[PDB]
Structure formats: structure tokens, C-alpha cells
Write a protein that binds this ligand. Structure first.
Ligand code: ZN
Lengths: 197, 21
């Protein structure tokens, strides 16, 4: 149900709390803006910015694809400069495309007491690692990143199903932690280990 | 643990420049 087709759109990467984007329920990392007021956003150009500007204090209708739910939804958003912060929406985006987006996640399984994972605040079963400050586009890439950060702090971005929020954690892999490996938690990857739909 | 106003710039498909709107 995307008029115009294609998988291009604007990947929402930041949503400031209490912004018009936040009030509309835009979710960082998972949401892709695919149209605004029925205009398909399938090109990297100024259409989105200009339509927001033309509609300051006027509700607009966005069509959004979520890589969390794998569904399209419509959201009403009111661009405004009266909410206290900077920008009409209070979001940051990059032109992108949503096909494959839901696959690059790593499911936190059991977490051992006193492990590097425990210390970082990783939560068994409900946490999903969604990325880091370097590219990870294959199953083994989180494990490679962990290897390359032996005894070094590593920033991970993490979604939690219970709070339904994303956060940043810092983990320091450590092969001398006392138990197996450098992490001390299980990690799942693949169709059984994606964010519950 | 950081939780606020985070930019999750960790997508390998993103092509365009990072824009604040
Ligand atoms: Zn992206």
C-alpha cells in the first residue's frame, strides 16, 4: 500500500524527545518516511524539507515503513517551531531504503553474572543489538567487532522489547573475565532472533 | 548508558547526508 512503489525513503535516525516527531510516534532507527501528504519520497532532494516548511503549524500525514513491525502506517505530524527545540520536526534523517533493514540485529540471550555483558547492562532475551559506530552487515560482524575490541570499550546501540526503546551501551570484551569467551552472554542471529513482530 | 536524543547512525544502507529537520 505504498503509492508509487519502490523501497527508498528517509531513514529516521534521531527523534528528540518532546518534539513534533516524538509526539507523532516517530521511532529512531526503525522508521522510514516514505511519503508526506501523498507525495512519494523516493528521491534525495528538498521535497520533504520544503513541504514541512510550507506546512508549519499544519498537520501533515506521513506514510511510514517500520523495520520493527514490517508494516506501513500513517502518522499525523505538525511541523512547528513552538515546541521549544530546534527544527520543525526535531528529527534527523538520511535518504535510504528499507529492504533488508530488519535483518541486521543481534539478539541477547542468557547473560552470565559479572560478565562483560552484565556490566554493560545487556538484558537477557529482551535486548537486541541494532548496531555500532562501524559497519555490520553480516551475522559474524558483531563477533568480529567484539574480537577487534578485546579489552577495549565498544559502543553498541541496543533496542529493548519491554521498554520498546533504543539506548547506547558501552561494553568492554574481556577474555579474562572468568568464564567462556569475552562477552559472557549468548547471541542469536537470524529469523528466530529478530525483534518480535 | 546514554538514552537521550541519540543519533543511531549505524545503518549500512543509508546513502544521503545526515539532515536535521
Ligand atoms: Zn539507513
Amino acid at each position: 500500500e505504498i503509492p508509487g512503489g519502490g523501497t527508498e525513503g528517509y531513514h529516521v535516525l534521531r527523534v528528540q524527545e518532546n518534539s513534533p516527531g516524538h509526539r507523532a510516534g516517530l521511532e529512531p532507527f526503525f522508521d522510514f518516511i516514505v511519503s508526506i501528504n501523498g507525495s512519494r519520497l523516493n528521491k534525495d532532494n528538498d521535497t520533504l524539507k520544503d513541504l514541512l516548511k510550507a506546512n508549519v503549524e499544519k498537520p501533515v500525514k506521513m506514510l511510514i515503513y517500520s523495520s520493527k513491525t514490517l508494516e506501513l502506517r500513517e502518522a499525523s505530524v505538525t511541523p512547528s517551531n513552538l515546541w521549544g527545540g530546534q527544527g520543525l520536526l526535531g528529527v534527523s534523517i538520511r535518504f535510504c531504503s528499507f529492504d533488508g533493514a530488519n535483518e541486521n540485529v543481534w539478539h541477547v540471550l542468557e547473560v552470565e553474572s559479572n560478565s562483560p555483558a552484565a556490566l554493560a547492562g545487556l538484558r537477557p532475551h529482551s535486548d537486541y543489538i541494532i548496531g555500532a559506530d562501524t559497519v555490520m552487515n553480516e551475522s559474524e560482524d558483531l563477533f568480529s567487532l567484539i574480537e577487534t575490541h578485546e579489552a577495549k570499550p565498544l559502543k553498541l546501540y541496543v533496542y529493548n522489547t519491554d521498554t520498546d526503546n533504543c539506548r547506547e551501551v558501552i561494553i568492554t570484551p574481556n577474555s579474562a573475565w572468568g568464564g567462556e569467551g569475552s562477552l559472557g552472554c549468548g547471541i542469536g542471529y537470524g529469523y528466530l532472533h529478530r525483534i518480535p513482530t | 548508558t546514554r538514552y537521550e536524543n541519540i543519533t543511531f547512525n549505524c545503518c549500512n544502507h543509508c546513502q544521503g547526508e545526515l539532515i536535521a529537520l
